[PDB]
Write a protein that binds this ligand. Structure first.
Ligand SMILES: COC(=O)N[C@H]1[C@H]([C@H](O)[C@H](O)CO)O[C@@](O)(C(=O)O)C[C@@H]1O
Ligand SMILES: COC(=O)N[C@H]1[C@H]([C@H](O)[C@H](O)CO)O[C@@](O)(C(=O)O)C[C@@H]1O
Ligand SMILES: COC(=O)N[C@H]1[C@H]([C@H](O)[C@H](O)CO)O[C@@](O)(C(=O)O)C[C@@H]1O
Ligand SMILES: [Zn+2]
Ligand SMILES: [Zn+2]
Ligand SMILES: [Zn+2]
Lengths: 183, 185, 183
C-alpha cells in the first residue's frame, strides 16, 4: 500500500473557518526513504472562499494542519476530516480505516519536535501556487514538518499572500515536494 | 507500468515541432512511482521563430505551446508537437524495440484533471514552474503544464512557455524542471 | 539500496571554507531511471556561517562539490566527507562503505562532460531556498550535473544571494528536485 490520499474529487473534506469549507487534495506516495507529495486546495465556502482585501485588509493567511499519532493515524483536531484520508483503492479509498502508516510520516530526526535545542529551517518547504491558475495571482504555500503539539507527527500547510486581492476565489494550482520518511 | 520510465531519450536530436518541422528537442522523462508520475522536462529550440528571441525588434513574441495528445491506451497521437518516433519506454539510453501499446498508468488522472466540460474548471490541473534560458539566473521563462485540457484525445499534457522580460538575441534552450501529477491507474 | 544519503542528523559532514564547517543533508532516492533528490544546508562555523554584506560586501556565493568515480564512489576531493555518505540503514548508514552506486549517478548523455560540442543548460536545476525559514531571506541553489573535471560524474551545489544581508545565519529550508540516472 504505497499511496495515502484524499480522493481527487471535489467533495469538501476540510474545515478551515467553518465546517467543510474546503477540499484539500493531498497525495502522499512512498518512494522508499522519501515521500513524494502533491497538493492543491479549493475553498468552496466561508471566510476564505472569495478574498477581498479592500473589504478585509488583514485576511492574508490561513493554516491547514494534519496531526498524526504514533501509528501515523490522522487525529480529529486536524483540519482535514478522518473519513476522507486513507490508502488508495482505484479512484477511491479502501472502505476500512487504516491502522498503520508510519512509513509515510515525516522523519523525527530530520524534523524534530520543538524543544530548547536550536531550531533549524530544514523542516520547512516553501512553494508558490496560483489562484485560479492566473500567473499574476501567487500565494505562498509553506509546509512545515513535526512542529505542532498534541501529536507524534504533523504536516502543516500555511497559505499566505502579499498582494491586495479583490474578489479572487481561493482555489489553487498544484505543487509537488518531498520529505524524508520516518521508516 | 509499476516502476518504468517513458521518455523522449536524453539525446539532443530534434523531436518536436513548434513553429516549423523539428525545430526543437523536448527532453521529457515520466517515471512511475505508484499513483504519481515523477516528471522531468527541458527544452532546446534549435531553429525557426522561437530559436533566438529579440523582444526589442519583436516585442509581441512572448509565448508558445507544445502539446502531447494521447488516446484511450496512453499512446501518443501523430498530431502532437512531439514526434512519435522516439517517445517510448526506456531501454538503456534509447527505447524498447516495439512502439508501445499501453501506458494508461502514465496518463493524468481524469477525476483529478477532467476534460473540458461546462462544469467548473479548477486550477489544480495546472503546475507552474520557472526555468532559465542558457542557464543564466537573470533569464527566467515560465513553464506552465496543464493536464487533460486538449480535445481530440483521451488524455493530454500541454507545456506553455512564456516570458515577461525583454530578451535581446537570447537562444531558447532551458534548464530542467521537475514536477509530478496524479496517475490514472 | 534504494537510498544514498548523508543521514538526517545535524553533525557537520562538509567543508566549505574550513574543515567540517557545515551539514549538507542530501537524500538521493532511486525511482527507476530518475533520482528524487532532497537537499538542505546548515552552516555552523567559518566564513559562510553569519553573512554580513555591510561588513563583507564580496561574500555572495559558495560551492559544494560532490565528485564520483566510474563506480559512483565519492572521491575525497569533494566538499562532502566520505565518512557518512552511504546507503541507508534506519536513520543511519550501512556498516561498510559501498563500492558501486552507478544507478544513482547523473546520466552522461543527458548531462555530458565539458567538450567542443555545444553546452546546453539542461544539466542545471535552479531552486530558491530561504535562510532561517524566513520568506524575505531567499538564496538561490543552482545544481549542476557532470561539469566538474577529474571525475566520471559530479553533482555541484552553488549557493548565492543578491540581497545585502546583515547578520543572517546560513541555514536553509529544504528543496526537492530530480535528475536522469545513468542506469
Ligand atoms: C510561474 O508564475 C510566476 O512566476 N508568476 C509571477 C508573476 C509573473 O512572472 C508575471 O505576472 C508575468 O505574467 O510576477 C509576479 O511578480 C506577480 O505577482 O505577477 C510574481 C508571480 O509569482
Ligand atoms: C532561481 O533563480 C532566480 O530566482 N533568479 C531570479 C533573478 C536573480 O535572483 C537575480 O538576477 C540575481 O541573480 O532575479 C530576477 O528578478 C531576474 O530576472 O533577474 C528573476 C529570476 O527569477
Ligand atoms: C515562497 O516565498 C517567496 O516567494 N518569497 C519572496 C518574498 C515574499 O513574497 C515577500 O517577502 C512576502 O513574504 O519577496 C521577495 O521579493 C523578498 O526577497 O522578500 C522574494 C522572495 O522570493
Ligand atoms: Zn463562489
Ligand atoms: Zn541555437
Ligand atoms: Zn549558527
Amino acid at each position: 500500500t504505497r499511496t495515502l490520499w484524499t480522493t481527487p474529487d471535489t467533495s469538501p473534506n476540510c474545515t478551515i473557518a467553518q465546517d467543510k469549507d474546503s477540499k484539500l487534495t493531498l497525495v502522499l506516495t512512498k518512494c522508499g526513504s522519501q515521500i513524494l507529495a502533491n497538493v492543491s486546495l479549493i475553498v468552496v465556502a466561508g471566510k476564505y472562499h472569495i478574498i477581498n482585501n479592500k473589504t478585509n485588509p488583514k485576511i492574508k493567511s490561513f493554516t491547514i494542519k494534519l496531526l498524526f499519532n504514533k501509528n501515523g493515524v490522522l487525529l480529529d483536531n486536524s483540519n482535514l476530516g478522518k473519513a476522507y484520508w486513507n490508502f488508495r483503492s482505484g479512484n477511491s479509498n479502501v472502505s476500512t480505516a487504516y491502522e498503520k502508516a508510519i512509513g509515510f510520516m515525516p522523519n523525527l530526526v530530520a524534523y524534530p519536535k520543538p524543544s530548547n535545542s536550536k531550531k533549524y529551517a530544514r523542516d520547512i518547504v516553501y512553494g508558490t501556487i496560483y489562484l485560479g491558475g492566473k500567473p499574476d495571482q501567487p500565494a505562498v504555500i509553506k509546509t512545515t514538518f513535526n512542529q505542532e503539539t498534541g501529536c507524534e507527527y504533523s504536516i502543516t500547510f500555511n497559505f499566505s499572500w502579499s498582494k491586495t486581492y479583490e474578489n479572487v476565489e481561493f482555489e489553487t494550482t498544484s505543487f509537488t515536494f518531498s520529505y524524508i520518511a520516518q521508516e
